[PDB]
Amino acid sequence: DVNTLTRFVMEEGRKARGTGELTQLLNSLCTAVKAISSAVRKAGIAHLYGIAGKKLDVLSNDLVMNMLKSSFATCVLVSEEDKHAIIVEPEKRGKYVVCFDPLDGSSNIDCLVSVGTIFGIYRKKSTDEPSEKDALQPGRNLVAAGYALYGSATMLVLAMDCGVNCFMLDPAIGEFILVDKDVKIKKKGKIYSLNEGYARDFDPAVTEYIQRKKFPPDNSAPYGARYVGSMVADVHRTLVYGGIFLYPANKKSPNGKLRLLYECNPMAYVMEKAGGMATTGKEAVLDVIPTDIHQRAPVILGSPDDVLEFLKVYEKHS
Amino acid sequence: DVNTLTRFVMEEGRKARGTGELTQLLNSLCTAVKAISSAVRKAGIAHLYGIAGKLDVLSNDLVMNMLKSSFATCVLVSEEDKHAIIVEPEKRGKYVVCFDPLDGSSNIDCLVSVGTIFGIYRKKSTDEPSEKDALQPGRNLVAAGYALYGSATMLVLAMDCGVNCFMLDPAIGEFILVDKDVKIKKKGKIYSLNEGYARDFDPAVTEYIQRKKFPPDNSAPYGARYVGSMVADVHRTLVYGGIFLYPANKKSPNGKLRLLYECNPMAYVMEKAGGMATTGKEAVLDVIPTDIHQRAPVILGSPDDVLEFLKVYEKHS
Amino acid sequence: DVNTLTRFVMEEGRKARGTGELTQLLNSLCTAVKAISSAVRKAGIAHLYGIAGKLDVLSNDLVMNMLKSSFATCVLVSEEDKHAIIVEPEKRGKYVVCFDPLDGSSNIDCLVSVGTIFGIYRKKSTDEPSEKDALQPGRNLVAAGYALYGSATMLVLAMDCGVNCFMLDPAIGEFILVDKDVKIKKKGKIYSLNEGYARDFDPAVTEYIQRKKFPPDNSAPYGARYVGSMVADVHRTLVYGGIFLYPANKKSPNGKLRLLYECNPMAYVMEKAGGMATTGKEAVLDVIPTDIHQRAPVILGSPDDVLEFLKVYEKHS
Amino acid sequence: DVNTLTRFVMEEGRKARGTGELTQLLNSLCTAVKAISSAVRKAGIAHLYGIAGVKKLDVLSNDLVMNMLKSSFATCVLVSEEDKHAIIVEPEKRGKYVVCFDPLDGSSNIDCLVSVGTIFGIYRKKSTDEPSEKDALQPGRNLVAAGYALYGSATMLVLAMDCGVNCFMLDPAIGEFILVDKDVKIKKKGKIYSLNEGYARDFDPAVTEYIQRKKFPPDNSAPYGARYVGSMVADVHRTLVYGGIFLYPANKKSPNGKLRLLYECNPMAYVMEKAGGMATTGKEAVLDVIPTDIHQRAPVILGSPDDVLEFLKVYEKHS
Numbered sequence A: 001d002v003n004t005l006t007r008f009v010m011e012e013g014r015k016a017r018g019t020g021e022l023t024q025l026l027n028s029l030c031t032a033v034k035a036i037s038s039a040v041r042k043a044g045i046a047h048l049y050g051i052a053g054k055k056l057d058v059l060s061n062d063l064v065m066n067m068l069k070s071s072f073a074t075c076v077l078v079s080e081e082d083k084h085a086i087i088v089e090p091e092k093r094g095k096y097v098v099c100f101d102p103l104d105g106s107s108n109i110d111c112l113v114s115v116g117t118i119f120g121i122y123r124k125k126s127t128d129e130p131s132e133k134d135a136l137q138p139g140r141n142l143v144a145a146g147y148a149l150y151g152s153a154t155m156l157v158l159a160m161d162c163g164v165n166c167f168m169l170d171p172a173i174g175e176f177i178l179v180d181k182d183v184k185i186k187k188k189g190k191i192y193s194l195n196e197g198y199a200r201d202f203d204p205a206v207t208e209y210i211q212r213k214k215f216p217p218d219n220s221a222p223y224g225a226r227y228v229g230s231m232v233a234d235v236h237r238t239l240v241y242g243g244i245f246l247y248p249a250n251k252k253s254p255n256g257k258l259r260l261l262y263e264c265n266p267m268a269y270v271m272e273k274a275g276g277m278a279t280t281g282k283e284a285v286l287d288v289i290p291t292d293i294h295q296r297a298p299v300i301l302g303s304p305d306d307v308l309e310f311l312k313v314y315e316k317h318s
Numbered sequence B, C: 001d002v003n004t005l006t007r008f009v010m011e012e013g014r015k016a017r018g019t020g021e022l023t024q025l026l027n028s029l030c031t032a033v034k035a036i037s038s039a040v041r042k043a044g045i046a047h048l049y050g051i052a053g054k055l056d057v058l059s060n061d062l063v064m065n066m067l068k069s070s071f072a073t074c075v076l077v078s079e080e081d082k083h084a085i086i087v088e089p090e091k092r093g094k095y096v097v098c099f100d101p102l103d104g105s106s107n108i109d110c111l112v113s114v115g116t117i118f119g120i121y122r123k124k125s126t127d128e129p130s131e132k133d134a135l136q137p138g139r140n141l142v143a144a145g146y147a148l149y150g151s152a153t154m155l156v157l158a159m160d161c162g163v164n165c166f167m168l169d170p171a172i173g174e175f176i177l178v179d180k181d182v183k184i185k186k187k188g189k190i191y192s193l194n195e196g197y198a199r200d201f202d203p204a205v206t207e208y209i210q211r212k213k214f215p216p217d218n219s220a221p222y223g224a225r226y227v228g229s230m231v232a233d234v235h236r237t238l239v240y241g242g243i244f245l246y247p248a249n250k251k252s253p254n255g256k257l258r259l260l261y262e263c264n265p266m267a268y269v270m271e272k273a274g275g276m277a278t279t280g281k282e283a284v285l286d287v288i289p290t291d292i293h294q295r296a297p298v299i300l301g302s303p304d305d306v307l308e309f310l311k312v313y314e315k316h317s
Numbered sequence D: 001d002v003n004t005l006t007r008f009v010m011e012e013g014r015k016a017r018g019t020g021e022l023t024q025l026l027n028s029l030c031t032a033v034k035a036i037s038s039a040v041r042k043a044g045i046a047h048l049y050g051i052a053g054v055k056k057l058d059v060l061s062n063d064l065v066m067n068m069l070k071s072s073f074a075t076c077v078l079v080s081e082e083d084k085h086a087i088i089v090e091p092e093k094r095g096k097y098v099v100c101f102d103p104l105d106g107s108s109n110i111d112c113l114v115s116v117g118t119i120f121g122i123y124r125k126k127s128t129d130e131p132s133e134k135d136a137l138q139p140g141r142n143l144v145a146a147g148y149a150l151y152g153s154a155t156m157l158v159l160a161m162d163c164g165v166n167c168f169m170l171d172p173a174i175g176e177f178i179l180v181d182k183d184v185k186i187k188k189k190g191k192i193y194s195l196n197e198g199y200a201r202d203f204d205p206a207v208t209e210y211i212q213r214k215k216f217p218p219d220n221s222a223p224y225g226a227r228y229v230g231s232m233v234a235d236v237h238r239t240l241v242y243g244g245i246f247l248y249p250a251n252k253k254s255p256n257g258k259l260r261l262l263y264e265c266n267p268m269a270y271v272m273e274k275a276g277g278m279a280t281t282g283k284e285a286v287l288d289v290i291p292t293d294i295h296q297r298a299p300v301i302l303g304s305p306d307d308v309l310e311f312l313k314v315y316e317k318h319s
């Protein structure tokens, strides 16, 4: 039986007997994602180049902000693009807090690299006036999370309590079609993924781990290397093929480079629901209690056996 | 003034005063590229999943069919076919085309950027057409390029007049000229190769990569990027500058990438953009092929970066 | 504030505190409409004509399949099917749906506007579902409307809260709310019917049309428009006002259009927009059907125009 | 073997051994038509209604055609329904053709989503003088090419040239015009008449009688059907496809009719005649009228030959 994102979400909403607010939010987000995908694929560019005589990340942010505000399902919105949390006007306020990166990887969009949208959804915990504090929850508290990848095609990956599900956008009809159900990552993979150009600044644990991938002590084949440089693409490949992705801490960056709330947490949630792992080195990404909405975190994620092996080496250097 | 691929090609055709065969070919190819892009972005997938109750193969069929019916080709070499395809007599024209209809497609399950690569030669011999007609050095290319199915779809076309980049506007199905007479940076800040085969590197590669990470002159280290799909890695190289390498290893002692329909078209694009492309021993475009699916090592990109690699290569004899 | 069809329906569903079944139904239907629109605008036709080497049937398949799998329906009546379709037990929900999947399609060769028409009823009893569950008067409609595949694609949805119009944005595949709580003009300036059958007209129709062309009170004559596709004619009538007629004659004492899935949905839309719809003898919505494909005469549009028609009808007894 | 508009045109251009200027013009026009179709089907309308949160459709349609034709290097004079005077192309962009067009016909009624279209006629510049409005005042007989795009249930381009009439469907998935009907010919006689009968009180008696005969046939054959979309491209296209007759005739109030000769009546008459149909003013072939003003009107009756001839019989009876 064919299924779409909207029908899938409604169906799980009815099972759970909820009030429908999350379904309204997810539908609204989905509409924004389709609009971002259209702009990313350059629909209407002929008009920009004078066939008849706004920047992408800004527009992407405007689309998500506007669709979420008008969903009546949110109260606090945190974006990569905004210095402070956005507090939704009273008459539009609902019970969810949303942290997102509207167009991740967009630094490099000039070369037409895969880009994506990342989101994490929390329930507001207190009855106080909404504020930035409502977004400072650990990833464990996520109600739903995921990403849209604008790649060779556009795919939405949604993780919730029921698992991880992948939906392909059919641009002929503008629907997200469920194509991979309850997806689970390989126990162990054959690809490692990080920027080795910064090898001079690596922590010795990272240096050793990568050494073992290239020059395996035992009699096994070396791992392959892939690094797109766009987190959604690298993480999605990791989910699909297995393996490991690293944006670790060093001396220069003791808290890593990626953002905890709207990059590391949603991806860690997806990984964990898919039976993978995600660590900072010292603890599970999802257990970090944030104190700042734009705070950074080291991240190492992927197949469980690979992450465990990394942890073993990390401890040897602790 | 706005310009499109078809109008641009017609305009250059008139200036050269040709008979129009190459324009018919390029137009045909462009149509196939649009059809590939549509299928790659998964238009109509709902029908596959039962709303009413294979990609590399289709891509090949599209290019084959559009080129055959262009009346402009005689020999077609494809990554997908073991032998060259000889066009039936009534449809024969004067060009030979070597292509990879969907490069990077082994990894399409993860929605990595894929692309279409093509090189176009004039039939050189007066013999009945055969596989031999495709065994020309890259120097003989009349036109070459690629379509990248990335965050958006772009067609990059290199000819004698230079390199030009066209964005597909999917709202109207037209390729809009957005970057004219493109030139690569003299020197870049990114290197691109699969370092997972480090154990098999020849010592020249090992040293060159060491210098990118640990620069002797105390400049900043280069960034690393490797998509694992050649069209994407090469296009980034064109756009941001830097260097791309796929050298020989134990598994692939003649390099891994295919000379006719991967290495040559990209080398031609690079050279027309003021870049370089080498096997280590010689320019990629100077290799005389003996087999249509033969492999070649390749190092390409910004001139200063490729020349630096060659310095190190020479040091190791 | 922007609004879409799905968000609009959900928000009215929550207000009404329903279980969500109607929302699942409407969302499913909306998906089928987008797929029909895509096929009607001929997406993928290049593949039909050999680039790599039925419409009414597909439209029906799309609606049938999307409604069955919505878990919200038990009985489906279609212009295309001689008997009602009874949904298999595990997929059965509480609603009955009558539809014409592609109205006007006999003339689709000339690219005339076509459309999809639908009416939705709540099931009558707790008995085993059967054809009988679809034989309700139009007054019982819970929701009704149409998609017009015209110069653009629009969905018109009528419910208790009124009539709302949504434009399909094909760039993103979303129905955008563009006209809220629409109301028809009290009186218009266009009449619409097939005057080629003038020899068979009831004398009341003859006289009414005469008065439109030769107005007794010295006002301007009405314009005439007749597309020959009911969704297009009715939508113009909603938007510009006026009157649409497919009346009874000697040859067709029950008219030509179908009551369940053409006349009733359009009458419901009209009435919710403050218009009227009559057979001549009674309101279309008051006819109690005895056969699912039964025909009905219909005269609909602006209230003043329909009332004037009725005056003349009464004069002829 | 599959064929597209651009390939078809290039192929006929090579056969004729021309310099390619007409091909550049037709390709440019085709690009504008695809841009019009996209806008007509409302691509990007969510942005108008505040999804993140300009130009009217006939104005944009005109801008698209003007701009694409000017930059084709193939035109010198452009006449548009939208512009009071002819546009003379700047010297560096001048080519040998004159183009008369209606960029979005039927657009007055676009609020109800009726079919709309683009109509065009292409002439060779005849004189060697500086280009001017005069270059557009040629009889339809001098047309080199003409046709129309119908933005209907789907988008179709109909192209008439010396080689005949050919119909191309736009595949919006790839943005190509696919040849679907070759060398099309109209039926000898049809069963549909098409005009606005709301203005029956102002009809010429010839028209009144002709229509009477369609509804109440003297020889007791079946009556004709009536269809009137109110958008000329849609009514004319149905006439081409199903056969029959289309009328926008002259009356006492409008002795020269209502439709425009250069960019409505002529291109449609040329298409009809290349398809083996007819097009008359009543007094003469539409293509034989020598224009004296670029926006001048003309009465028009066109379609299947037998139907037009029958209309002319009745017209002659009323002197």
Ligand SMILES: CNC(=O)Nc1cc(Br)cc(NC(=O)NS(=O)(=O)c2cc(C)c(CCOC)s2)n1
Pocket (backbone or CB within 6 Å): A009, A010, A012, A013, A014, A016, A017, A018, A019, A020, A021, A022, A023, A024, A143, A160, A161, C018, C019, C020, C021, C023, C024
């Ligand atoms: C009692 N409800 C009822 O009678 N009808 C009805 C109809 C529709 Br249509 C939708 C819903 N409910 C929701 O949508 N609930 S929810 O938004 O809170 C939700 C979404 C998801 C996805 C959940 C499951 C995931 O939980 C983590 S919980 N209910």
Ligand SMILES: CNC(=O)Nc1cc(Br)cc(NC(=O)NS(=O)(=O)c2cc(C)c(CCOC)s2)n1
Pocket (backbone or CB within 6 Å): B009, B010, B011, B012, B013, B014, B016, B017, B018, B019, B020, B021, B022, B023, B024, B142, B159, B160, B161, D018, D019, D020, D021, D023, D024
């Ligand atoms: C003598 N011609 C004439 O009278 N009219 C006319 C009109 C049109 Br429209 C096109 C053309 N000619 C061509 O298109 N020639 S071509 O196919 O061979 C070609 C294409 C490209 C791109 C070339 C340059 C590439 O090599 C450097 S060469 N000619």
Ligand SMILES: CNC(=O)Nc1cc(Br)cc(NC(=O)NS(=O)(=O)c2cc(C)c(CCOC)s2)n1
Pocket (backbone or CB within 6 Å): A018, A019, A020, A021, A023, A024, C009, C010, C011, C012, C013, C014, C016, C017, C018, C019, C020, C021, C022, C023, C024, C142, C143, C159, C160, C161
């Ligand atoms: C108790 N519900 C709850 O807690 N949450 C919740 C969330 C969502 Br999301 C949707 C809904 N319910 C519906 O959609 N109900 S409905 O399908 O029957 C309906 C649709 C329309 C439009 C109606 C109006 C009747 O039209 C005549 S009634 N409920």
Ligand SMILES: CNC(=O)Nc1cc(Br)cc(NC(=O)NS(=O)(=O)c2cc(C)c(CCOC)s2)n1
Pocket (backbone or CB within 6 Å): B018, B019, B020, B023, B024, D009, D010, D011, D012, D013, D014, D016, D017, D018, D019, D020, D021, D022, D023, D024, D144, D145, D161, D162, D163
């Ligand atoms: C001598 N040419 C040559 O060597 N190569 C070459 C290549 C291409 Br590609 C195109 C063309 N020529 C044209 O396109 N000529 S045209 O613009 O005037 C024309 C178009 C149409 C459609 C015609 C038929 C018009 O009938 C009225 S005439 N030539």
